Design a protein around this ligand. Structure first.
Ligand SMILES: Cc1cc(CCCCCOc2c(Cl)cc(C3=NCCO3)cc2Cl)on1
Ligand SMILES: Cc1cc(CCCCCOc2c(Cl)cc(C3=NCCO3)cc2Cl)on1
Lengths: 236, 273, 255, 40, 273, 59, 59, 57, 40, 40
């Protein structure tokens, strides 16, 4: 008989501990694995695939239309859309990125925001996208917007433009649930010159917008998502 | 590892930021393709986002309850909760469900922890000390009819005996029929015109049955069982879109009617911040 | 002078040419291949009809109009009646296959509109009834007709609400599945190569569909002034590397 | 040290440290180079 | 090591005891610079004054309380102490606080011990055996509304289940946002004119939530939770003047008005002994 | 199963003992350290800095 | 005295676990084995012997 | 280990499927003696049918 | 590691991995070859 | 022997045995020698 002493914590059950256990089914042989395409190893692998952002959130019931950012022909100087960058809330929240970020407490890294244009091929347009780093207000006019991170996008044969929100930060991690100290800025978009439709054409054209994370990205300290809950156990 | 390299002014014919998303690719664009950057290192590995880590902590998968009381004159033990069962399924509780349904097929060993606590809602002189018996009735096995049947003998059925207030723990290999567990299944048992649809037809791995070994004291004792499940040795294939609407049933994808808009409406314009 | 843009796919006795492609997607970066022995279970030698089943079948055409919500086809169902592919299907106990899907929609440089073409492995549909109502067989086996998401709820059928993918997930996130867009201004076809994806090495072709192909208008069709307000969309699909096993009497399936 | 005989009874697995998003982010048939035109 | 060397009479032009304190230095003068000394050795290392040792013992950081009782008809569990929470902070209790505030920035892993004891202030037949469940709701997590919510499922939230009378123990890495914990912070969240001031704005790491798993017995049971915290792997920068006045608030430096003189007045003259 | 005997003191909590514990946050990666001037290692380092004495205590 | 911690599952009895136990009969010597024809090692050995099927179940 | 070997058409004078059960033997006939098979491996050892396992719980 | 002195006290035995059905499936005195006629 | 995988779970650290008061006691720009005049 070897002398022992038990410490504080004996008998506790910590849902996060990782130890060995007896197998209830001694000697059982599991089914062989066969090959299946698509294996995922890290959630970091999947948040780099871009998905659509319901940017046009202004509706009243969920609709395919809140994915469409409208553009008006012949407007000059004006603003196309605006949003803050609380990736865990608001427009971002239902996107795959938003949806995964919510399983973690802290995030750090660069984001990739792209816009794909869908107007007739014989039209043309020049837009400016601007990222405003924390510390200033959402820009109120392009002059204000153009003094921060921006890209003049020229609509052409190449249909999409990929803007990166480079990680601009004092503190090396921000909280995914919106927090002030930790806030990330604003994203706005304005006409640089203006949309022009060809003859025989009319109305609004739309941009689709996507979001995905750069390879830069870090997420840490897992927790429970506000995105799902329940009141009684489900039955068959 | 560098998180960003140093990059300076650019005036090229080589534009990495113009792409064609119609192709289905997400081109790997970085901050340094469109602003001037400085070197910085990652200092991070992405350890805690590994799927083994993501699915590897215990989650509550089931809460049931049984009572110790005089079975004298009870015509239906099962019905008096003289003993209950849990028809093994991981779709009951939605917290762990949403996580799992991020993938199509999943393969893992399970580690179960079972916590049992007792309650004595009406006048008792004391708290008795009960011993629980959890036995897994594999499909095609004699189902316990009573609370002291011949089934409880479980001479070939893995069973565990632990005390109420205490916890029981063990782990089970992956007992799936196929090469992996189907998180989703767009098919039927057979080519019938009324046969059910889903996985509820695929995930038929019997049920677990609990009961209190002890006879009855003068008072009644409620024992409530909580089953926790931890995946170990995880393998997951084919990522899918996360669950947006609420769940209604174990094993079907169905969402409730007149549900509410899941996308938050802006308080303001598209232009609003 | 090769462009990403022009392409030719010859499979069996049938060829497709596109002069306005946008590359092609190969699901999960894997190309269809036959079933290796190391992965095999059934001891039966399989049958590989080759060129008589691995050719291009063009399903009947759809009509995109300003009110369209989107269409959904299931595989191998959509092909249950095409030539010898279909016969083999009803006659063997088990079968396995990959596909090349080519979705076509041409317009002019004055039109606008953008379709999402996506392949979803194991697309289990939801009942519009809620609760645990099931979706009857016939409803998930529309055949070449596919399911029309702008048709009415029917009884025992699935829900047809687009912003929920027919299953409780948001349209916006379908982009995690192999997919390609058809943006009239860019593109005129979409091509996806689908490797066989299952948790078993070979399965039944009638009780289980292993992918749904979905074509969904996202930016509404907008025709030039006084143009007819609609465009046809055509889907052509070719089984590839098909194998059938466990031949016998010939399945009888509901309806 | 494993104290138990069966593999299911061992603790959690250890980090894939695999990580390759290209099956998801770039499943295109003809390779796309960043910087070269998307559609030629 | 010598504590003092031998030194004899001196009649020099080299005076080590005259200095200019205006410079900000504390010149390293020793007994042997001004008296005649003999050799002596230190016999000591200064082991127990290492900062790891100084901050490394468990200190009580929080006492809360929850009760097990029939929740039937309770409109606000939180309010009935059907379950409580502790909005993680180490400024509550001042014993450990003063020690920590000897430094400006501090970095360490935490080891928590949680002792839970039960009380039955009014007539009970017995002492029941309850099982406590401590779950850490990271900020941006579904906060438990009830005592048997879906939140308690904690499928992604680290949680521990231990018995009342017993102790629970675990340790946590340093979960600080920055490179170290700010003991003080002379700034604000943002450039507002009404925004709070201090660290109370920096130290927002959610809260811990306790509850009793067991249902209710016939009597009521008070369970009082004591959280102890031990720093391990300590790193401390920039020493500061010790706290002289009493504390009034978590996270602000504020002292009470009409406080009392903190320097003891002489009973006698400056000349007094 | 290896035979053991538990000694007096089992289960006690001594606020001054130093042992290992399970981490509640398995696999989490702490923020990198950056350099900060002023690190203190021993309280013996700081009690050698001189400070003023309120000698005139008579108020 | 070596410090220990007990985990969840302590004290449980799992009918399928396989561990060592003290022998109640220390030092006892079992009867020698003699040879007996017919040893079975696997149930897989015996299910390969064919047996009759009551196919005509209609009685 | 192979569970089935590959075997093709047969037109022989050597018939493994005709036997005389009166002898008391169970002749070791396999799928590949009477249909055309493909190779497949066992992937299994028969561990949990060992008599030690069967009587050991 | 055995902690106990007697052999009865050790854990379960380990798989025969013996397996030879012929004493049961082919106890015939003159050897029968599959493919050759049963009765000559 | 660490029984646990993570570094936070290890016991207390071990004595700096670093000790250098000069950053606090003599942060002067031009070095002062004891015995030499303070102000020259
Ligand atoms: C998907 C998916 C995965 C699972 C898990 C299936 C559980 C398999 C059976 O697991 C058990 C075994 Cl092998 C033994 C015992 C047991 N032995 C003694 C007491 O309980 C309990 C369970 Cl749940 O369900 N859907
Ligand atoms: C300065 C300073 C330092 C701290 C400490 C912050 C605590 C961080 C979170 O710590 C916990 C974790 Cl990671 C887990 C659990 C826990 N897991 C299961 C039960 O409790 C509890 C805490 Cl306090 O606060 N101000």
């Amino acid at each position: 008989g070897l002398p022992t002493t038990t410490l504080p914590g004996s008998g506790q059950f910590l849902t996060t501990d990782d130890r060995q256990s007896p197998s209830a089914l001694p000697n059982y042989e599991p089914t062989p694995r066969i090959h299946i395409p698509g294996k995922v190893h890290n959630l970091l692998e999947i948040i780099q695939v871009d998905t659509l952002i319901p940017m046009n959130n202004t509706h009243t019931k969920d609709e395919v239309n809140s994915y469409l950012i409208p553009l008006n022909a012949n407007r000059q100087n004006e603003q196309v859309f605006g949003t803050n960058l609380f990736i865990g809330d608001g427009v971002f929240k239902t996107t795959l990125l938003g949806e995964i970020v919510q399983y973690y407490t802290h995030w750090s890294g660069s984001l990739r925001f792209s816009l794909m244009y869908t107007g007739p091929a014989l039209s043309s347009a020049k837009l400016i996208l601007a990222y405003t780093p924390p510390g200033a207000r959402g820009p109120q006019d392009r002059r204000e917007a153009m003094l921060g991170t921006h890209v003049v996008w020229d609509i052409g044969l190449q249909s999409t433009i990929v803007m990166t929100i480079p990680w601009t930060s004092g503190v090396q991690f921000r909280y995914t649930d919106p927090d002030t100290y930790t806030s990330a800025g604003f994203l706005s978009c304005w006409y640089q010159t203006s949309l022009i439709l060809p003859p025989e054409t009319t109305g609004q054209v739309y941009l689709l917008s996507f979001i995905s994370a750069c390879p830069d990205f870090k997420l840490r300290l897992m927790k429970d998502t506000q995105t799902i809950s329940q009141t009684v156990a489900l039955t068959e | 590892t560098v998180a960003s390299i140093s990059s300076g002014p650019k005036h090229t014919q080589k534009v990495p930021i113009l792409t064609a998303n119609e192709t289905g690719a997400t081109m790997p664009v970085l901050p340094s393709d469109s602003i001037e950057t400085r070197t910085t290192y990652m200092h991070f590995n992405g350890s805690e986002t590994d799927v083994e880590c993501f699915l590897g902590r215990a989650a509550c998968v089931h809460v049931t309850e049984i009572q110790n009381k005089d079975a004298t004159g009870i015509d239906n033990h099962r019905e008096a909760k003289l003993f209950n069962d849990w028809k093994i399924n991981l779709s009951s509780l939605v917290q762990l469900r949403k996580k799992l349904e991020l993938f199509t097929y999943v393969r893992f060993d399970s580690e179960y922890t079972i916590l049992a606590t007792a309650s004595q809602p009406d006048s008792a002189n004391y708290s008795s000390n009960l011993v629980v018996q959890a036995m897994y009735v594999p499909p095609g096995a004699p189902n316990p009819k009573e609370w002291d049947d011949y089934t409880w003998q479980s001479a070939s059925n893995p069973s565990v005996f632990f005390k109420v207030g205490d916890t029981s723990r063990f782990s089970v290999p992956y007992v799936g029929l196929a090469s992996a567990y189907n998180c989703f299944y767009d098919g039927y048992s057979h080519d019938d015109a009324e046969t059910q649809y889903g996985i509820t037809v695929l995930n038929h791995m019997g049920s677990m049955a609990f009961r209190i070994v002890n006879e009855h004291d003068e008072h009644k004792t409620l024992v409530k069982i909580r089953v926790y499940h931890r995946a170990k040795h995880v393998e997951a294939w084919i990522p899918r879109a996360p669950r947006a609407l609420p769940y209604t049933s174990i094993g079907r994808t169905n969402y409730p009617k007149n549900t509410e808009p899941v996308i938050k409406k802006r308080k303001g314009d598209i232009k609003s911040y | 002078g090769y462009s990403d843009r022009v392409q030719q796919i010859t499979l069996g006795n049938s060829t497709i040419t596109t002069q306005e492609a946008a590359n092609a997607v190969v699901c999960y970066a894997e190309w269809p291949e036959y079933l290796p022995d190391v992965d095999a279970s059934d001891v039966n030698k399989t049958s590989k009809p080759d060129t008589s089943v691995c050719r291009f079948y063009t399903l009947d055409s759809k009509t995109w109009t300003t009110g369209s919500k989107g269409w959904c086809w299931k595989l191998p169902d959509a092909l249950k009646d095409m030539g010898v592919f279909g016969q083999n299907m009803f006659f063997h106990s088990l079968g396995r296959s990959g596909y090349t899907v080519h979705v076509q929609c041409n317009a002019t440089k004055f039109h606008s509109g953008c379709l999402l073409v996506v392949v979803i492995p194991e697309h289990q549909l939801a009942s519009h009834e809620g609760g645990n109502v099931s979706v009857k067989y016939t409803f998930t086996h529309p055949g070449e007709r596919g399911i029309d998401l702008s048709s009415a709820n029917e009884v025992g059928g699935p829900v047809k609400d687009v912003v929920y993918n027919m299953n409780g997930t948001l349209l916006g996130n379908l982009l995690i599945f192999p997919h390609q867009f058809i943006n009239l201004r860019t593109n005129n076809t979409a091509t996806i190569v689908i490797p066989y994806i299952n948790s078993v090495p070979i399965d039944s072709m009638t009780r289980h569909n292993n992918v749904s192909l979905m074509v969904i208008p996202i930016a509404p069709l907008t025709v030039p002034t006084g143009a007819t307000p609609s465009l046809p969309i055509t889907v052509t699909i070719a089984p590839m590397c098909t194998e059938f096993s466990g031949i016998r009497s010939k399945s009888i399936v509901p309806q | 040290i494993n104290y138990y005989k069966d593999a299911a009874s061992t603790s959690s697995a250890g980090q894939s440290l695999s990580m390759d998003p290209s099956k998801f982010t770039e499943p295109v048939k003809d390779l796309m180079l960043k910087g070269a035109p998307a559609l030629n």
